Design a protein around this motif. Structure first.
Motif, PDB file in Angstrom:
ATOM      1  N   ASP A  78       4.538  -6.331   5.281  1.00 46.56           N
ATOM      2  CA  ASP A  78       3.127  -6.729   5.177  1.00 46.56           C
ATOM      3  C   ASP A  78       2.272  -5.655   4.506  1.00 46.56           C
ATOM      4  N   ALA A  79       2.710  -4.392   4.575  1.00 47.90           N
ATOM      5  CA  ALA A  79       2.012  -3.280   3.954  1.00 47.90           C
ATOM      6  C   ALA A  79       1.869  -3.463   2.433  1.00 47.90           C
ATOM      7  N   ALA A  80       2.890  -4.007   1.761  1.00 46.49           N
ATOM      8  CA  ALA A  80       2.842  -4.294   0.323  1.00 46.49           C
ATOM      9  C   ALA A  80       1.810  -5.375  -0.049  1.00 46.49           C
ATOM     10  N   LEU A  81       1.401  -6.213   0.911  1.00 42.23           N
ATOM     11  CA  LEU A  81       0.502  -7.348   0.687  1.00 42.23           C
ATOM     12  C   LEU A  81      -0.921  -7.092   1.191  1.00 42.23           C
ATOM     13  N   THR A  82      -1.072  -6.350   2.290  1.00 44.31           N
ATOM     14  CA  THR A  82      -2.334  -6.287   3.049  1.00 44.31           C
ATOM     15  C   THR A  82      -2.825  -4.875   3.344  1.00 44.31           C
ATOM     16  N   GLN A  83      -1.989  -3.839   3.190  1.00 45.64           N
ATOM     17  CA  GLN A  83      -2.442  -2.464   3.398  1.00 45.64           C
ATOM     18  C   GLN A  83      -3.469  -2.097   2.322  1.00 45.64           C
ATOM     19  N   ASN A  84      -4.585  -1.493   2.740  1.00 48.80           N
ATOM     20  CA  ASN A  84      -5.700  -1.144   1.852  1.00 48.80           C
ATOM     21  C   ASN A  84      -6.247  -2.349   1.061  1.00 48.80           C
ATOM     22  N   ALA A  85      -6.339  -3.517   1.707  1.00 45.96           N
ATOM     23  CA  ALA A  85      -6.860  -4.731   1.091  1.00 45.96           C
ATOM     24  C   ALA A  85      -8.192  -4.481   0.356  1.00 45.96           C
ATOM     25  N   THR A  86      -8.222  -4.792  -0.939  1.00 45.27           N
ATOM     26  CA  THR A  86      -9.391  -4.619  -1.825  1.00 45.27           C
ATOM     27  C   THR A  86     -10.248  -5.879  -1.938  1.00 45.27           C
ATOM     28  N   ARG A  87      -9.853  -6.963  -1.261  1.00 45.31           N
ATOM     29  CA  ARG A  87     -10.522  -8.267  -1.273  1.00 45.31           C
ATOM     30  C   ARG A  87     -10.621  -8.822   0.143  1.00 45.31           C
ATOM     31  N   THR A  88     -11.736  -9.488   0.439  1.00 47.50           N
ATOM     32  CA  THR A  88     -11.922 -10.297   1.652  1.00 47.50           C
ATOM     33  C   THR A  88     -12.272 -11.733   1.281  1.00 47.50           C
ATOM     34  N   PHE A  89     -11.842 -12.695   2.098  1.00 45.99           N
ATOM     35  CA  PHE A  89     -12.214 -14.107   1.956  1.00 45.99           C
ATOM     36  C   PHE A  89     -13.563 -14.437   2.613  1.00 45.99           C
ATOM     37  N   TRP A  90     -14.098 -13.540   3.447  1.00 44.38           N
ATOM     38  CA  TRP A  90     -15.258 -13.809   4.311  1.00 44.38           C
ATOM     39  C   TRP A  90     -16.572 -13.227   3.791  1.00 44.38           C
ATOM     40  N   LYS A  91     -16.550 -12.573   2.626  1.00 44.28           N
ATOM     41  CA  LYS A  91     -17.735 -12.062   1.940  1.00 44.28           C
ATOM     42  C   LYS A  91     -17.587 -12.296   0.443  1.00 44.28           C
ATOM     43  N   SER A  92     -18.558 -12.976  -0.163  1.00 47.81           N
ATOM     44  CA  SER A  92     -18.608 -13.138  -1.611  1.00 47.81           C
ATOM     45  C   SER A  92     -19.062 -11.838  -2.279  1.00 47.81           C
ATOM     46  N   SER A  93     -18.378 -11.469  -3.355  1.00 50.26           N
ATOM     47  CA  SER A  93     -18.826 -10.470  -4.320  1.00 50.26           C
ATOM     48  C   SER A  93     -19.055 -11.179  -5.649  1.00 50.26           C
ATOM     49  N   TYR A  94     -20.133 -10.845  -6.351  1.00 53.27           N
ATOM     50  CA  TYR A  94     -20.419 -11.356  -7.689  1.00 53.27           C
ATOM     51  C   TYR A  94     -20.697 -10.194  -8.647  1.00 53.27           C
ATOM     52  N   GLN A  95     -20.461 -10.413  -9.937  1.00 49.49           N
ATOM     53  CA  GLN A  95     -20.801  -9.467 -11.000  1.00 49.49           C
ATOM     54  C   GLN A  95     -22.123  -9.891 -11.642  1.00 49.49           C
TER      55      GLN A  95
END
Lengths: 482, 482, 482, 50, 50
Positions: free
Chosen positions: C14-31
């Protein structure tokens, strides 16, 4: 003045969106890629291909990666002859339209609602009495308003000549089971019923597999036309490595393992429907009775050829691929209340379920997941984890239409139900949610089915439940393993 | 030799594309994500649900985020009885096919072109004279070549029995208006007409809402079949937070605000069409006249459960979400030239507009945006900013087909027109263009309509204009506000 | 307890997939993006527009970038009159349904299989003998099972009145060739046949060009209805810069070059089909014989207006754009074995090929790529590089359906074949594979066609091969060049 | 014929103009007003007991 | 002070007005409505009876 004023009309809120903009719409940027080529190569099975048998192929090493995989099936054209005119009339039995077992099963449920002398009635009078009894049955069971008898008397204009045809979506039906094996271990397994369900939910508009699998959307006259001549079908095998180029199976990294496709073929008796029970089905070109050795298949594989530097890098360090594996729970149904105990393992992304009436299967309509009289076979379903409701009781339309609308590229035209734990279960490279079934003591899918489902002529109807689960395929020192 | 030579045949131009390549096609990379689960929960309204009333629900706090939202509507099956056979014949009036107000309105426009003794003519002779007068009208107004009279005499094969049915796309029509409220403030408002327009333009192939909203694509026989039994509809509410997982509404960040859905329901008289004017419409199961209390609805919400670390992070700093809000300009039309003054605010992404004839509305065909005789009601339109042409006069087909082709997932099957200031108005997270209407002194949509539009029997035809605008929703200290 | 346990049930995988996650599904980011506006502007041709002529337009400089480009075509309504009733009956010849050259060509291939007195037979007896001879021909050539004669007797219900109509997809057919020129150099060329093939393969579900190009999917009655009145068509010109906003053509960076669209128009005689050979075709409004000067066209261009800072940056450094150019190999076919020598240059992404019977072209059915009796004209094809098989012999269905399934947004409804060297040939900004044809001494497409293809009445059938190739457009000091 | 566009309405408002000292005091400290708000429950009736 | 609506006023529609700032306080508020006089004619005598 207005357009320049809009560019100047910025505040502290616009700073979060446009300050230090890293992208422009008015200049294209592109990335350079490494050199590669694609080659499609057709390969014969290592064993004989026959109806009802199991066959395997060892996949050749004709490139560095394996990408797309299609089962190329060749079916002969069909002709029919009267059994009385045939020098050897002894053949396997086929489903026949003069003996519609599905229509007889539907009539059996309305027999208690027929008023008057049914046994002695003329044929046209029996059809009227059955249509009236259908209204009485549906009023009693569903509080349905009666339909005009003339609207229930749909004559399917069947042609006034003799024919036989290959069943609907024959390209999927032929593949009872396929297994992708590496080094003798089964990496994944797919089923005919799963392939159809996956095409219903994930099949994109304008890219439906219709012609490629012999699917007409239940138009018998088109199946008849197609079945008069040789058919070449290209059935896609939806393995994890066929879903995205970055998941292509690294042949160079698995050098010491044989890669095999194993296919269990459908029985010939299940593949053909005929106009009448007394017809012999012939191979159209050879003018001999159709037999189990008339199935022909080959495997069409797309290989990727890499530049030496990328090939050497991949051989030195292929690492790990995220894979999706399929699991199946298959159950017989003999009651309107059904509990399926889902003994699936790993992080499950989603599951599909659907029912098949015994009468639909016996009629050769293998992908007809409808209930009695073409109704929805599920009234409601509930999902339980350790006897706690994970999804409380919901009506069939929620599992069929709302789940498909939320998570899938398409809504199913048949009674296929789904449920996703993933926000994007069709994304092969980005995990977006799962439930780990290897950490649940019980997973139960409780179903309330329509009245009389699995009773009488439908005793031993089938429940299919398929799950998609995450696993990891590891490549090390020329070997591959789960 | 050739494939290796291709990898060596690189120059200074290839360096911009492939030098220091950061991606390979032959190895999958995946990102790890945080743990989450999805749960669908059905909730009753806080007030009574009835036709023509307003109802509200306070949304429960059963997870950390709110994702999908569906209005679950249950409509009874319909039956009909003659008014003479009914113990209480007094019911609201419904549109009836024996009194086709839309066909009568179309005939009224061609009356000046009828040559000969129309009043004294036989029924078959009146139909001939109307078809000939239609050719003369269309030749005079549009320089149209005459159609053969036999090609204009389309008999819709209407069944020779009594029926009533729920109107086309009844799931949208029922929702005259819905308001998403937080802390007593309206965050967004949607309308029946907007929901239909959004599904026409943004509805993806193979994921059209047909069954989920009771839409048949104007096949009356399918509406009749569906209306004989109970219908369960799942109407998606397309709020900003339902469009992308990163926009899911943070329930934990808004702890001190009630979240409410308010719904204004359609009147029962507008929801039903009957074969004949003298029929009483009954609830099919209860055998009583249909009444305003027979509407049932509930709210189906998808909750997201987060891991404690992500939940705590979101509670501490939910920050700001980019939102899309909807605005409406609704106008009566009584002339072929119409100017709509669009008093919309904020950065507008795009707008939609369409017209409804009074006769189509009165016939119960609420989503029929066609003109007279089913023609395009718009000849041309112009968009003005501060009396300067932002879009010069363009024909209807440019606003309907070219704008949809450029900016939308689908082309509308009805006369819906759009215009986008955004390159990707369907992207909910990436701003791609807007016009700030709060900085324009005037925005005018000038329309030239077909001849006789809004005259006589179509006096008080409707113009709908809907705009999509950017705003920011801010979360701070357990409160949420625009 | 279960949902929290799932978040804790993590291991080293799971560390290869989720360790230091740079994205969340629960907060929008926009440019944030730069300010821009879009404007659609219609422009007349610089030369006269006429059938069979060449016309050009110099594109105006009304913004900073050029994005979308549509050819706006206006076609008059058609009427017909008997030649005997016309004061000037002399007009160009048009294809007529009383002289069906395609049906006559199909009959010519089955003449050797007609048993009995064909010449002296009644019309109904001739139709029977032709249907029986079709069965004998198809049995002899294809080992086909005979179809019931009644199933081959498809009466197209043609209306019992006089008409003329514009040919199917007239908006594409009108554009025999278009050239995009910059500074007098041709940057790209498109053909009618290529535009149709591109729409078949790349045309998205729900965004098909049907109405915008006058395409009915071969429903003659809809072409007749549309052709009775003026038609306004918006034909998209699929240049590299219309495919993605970052590829928009930088007008400001090319200040010293004229931008021109050149269009070679179809001949009027090829654009119209009539019910009968003895009819004169009239302009419906003007009541004069239709003539070459009745074609009207204009160019609708979408301009982008940039903020001054982005405009100045683009003027200072527009750099280079990756472009896709089109190449064509056009060949006459007079034999069932055809070798096409593909003298294309540059890195080819993919190619398309298809055949047109002479009889289909002469019948005015310009986009009917079917063989004899509507069959597939290709049996098999092989692709050779320097006399070495790059793709070994594959059946038509592999080139048509498997290649489209793998690489395209849609499967073609007509007999269009493709082959991609690119993993994503529809991505305009990301190179995903190519073969460099400027480094191959020979590229040969070898075709085995159906029996009697290019014989007798089909002598000079057409083979079309189109390739898509990468090139680079460079902008420097106000000039643009390949 | 009477039509939906024949309705005309405008808003007549009474404004209060204050002396500068009271205006400045009110701008600096308007504080809080007690207000009365209206709420509605609207229901259909189909029985003698409601 | 009498003020026009910001949007068109019509039967069955919704209209709004942004209240002007023409003093320091707002006191009385009246909706000034103007309704036309009515006449009637037989439907048989009317060129557009709908």
């Amino acid at each position: 003045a207005g357009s320049l004023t809009q560019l100047l009309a910025t505040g502290s809120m616009d700073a979060a969106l446009t300050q230090n903009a890293t992208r422009t719409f008015w200049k294209s940027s592109y990335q350079k890629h490494s050199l590669f080529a694609l080659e499609s190569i057709n390969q014969p099975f290592t064993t004989q291909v026959q109806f009802g048998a199991e066959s395997h192929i060892t996949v050749n090493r004709q490139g560095d990666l394996l990408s797309w995989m299609y089962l190329k099936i060749v079916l002969p054209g069909l002709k029919v002859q009267n059994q009385a005119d045939t020098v050897q009339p002894t053949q396997q039995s086929f489903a026949s339209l003069d003996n519609d077992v599905a229509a007889q099963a539907d009539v059996s449920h309305v027999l208690p609602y027929i008023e008057g002398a049914y046994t002695e009635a003329s044929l046209n009078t029996k059809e009227q009495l059955i249509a009236e009894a259908k209204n009485s049955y549906e009023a009693a069971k569903y509080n349905a308003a009666p339909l005009p008898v003339a609207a229930q008397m749909q004559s399917t204009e069947m042609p006034d000549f003799d024919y036989a045809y290959w069943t609907e979506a024959i390209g999927f039906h032929l593949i009872k089971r396929a297994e992708f094996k590496v080094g003798g271990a089964t990496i994944d397994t797919i089923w005919s019923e799963l392939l159809f369900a996956m095409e219903e939910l994930m099949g994109r508009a304008g890219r439906r597999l219709t012609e490629t699998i012999g699917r007409t959307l239940r138009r018998p006259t088109e199946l008849m036309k197609a079945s008069r001549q040789e058919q070449i079908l290209y059935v896609p095998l939806p393995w994890y490595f066929t879903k995205h180029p970055s998941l292509a199976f690294p042949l160079v990294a698995a050098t010491y393992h044989n890669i095999q496709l194993w296919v269990q073929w459908a029985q010939l008796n299940s593949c053909i429907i005929k106009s009448r029970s007394n017809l012999v089905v012939l191979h159209a070109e050879r003018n001999v009775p159709i037999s189990d050795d008339h199935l022909r298949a080959s495997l069409e594989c797309t290989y990727v050829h890499l530049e030496a530097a990328e090939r050497d890098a991949l051989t030195a360090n292929a690492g790990t691929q995220l894979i999706v594996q399929h699991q199946a729970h298959l159950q017989q149904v003999s009651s309107n209340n059904v509990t399926a105990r889902l003994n699936f393992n790993f992080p499950v992304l989603e599951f599909y379920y659907f029912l098949r009436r015994k009468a639909n299967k016996d009629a050769g309509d293998h992908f007809n997941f409808s209930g009695i009289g073409g109704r929805d076979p599920v009234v409601s379903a509930e999902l339980l984890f350790n006897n706690t409701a994970r999804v409380t009781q919901k009506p069939a339309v929620w599992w069929r239409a709302v789940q498909a609308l939320q998570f899938h590229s398409s809504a199913p035209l048949t009674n296929i139900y789904s449920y996703s734990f993933s926000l994007s279960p069709e994304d092969p490279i980005t995990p977006s949610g799962s439930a780990n079934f290897s950490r649940l003591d019980s997973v139960e899918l409780a179903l309330t089915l329509q009245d009389d489902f699995g009773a009488a002529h439908d005793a031993n109807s089938e429940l299919f439940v398929f799950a998609r689960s995450y696993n990891i395929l590891k490549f090390t020192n020329g070997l591959a393993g789960l």
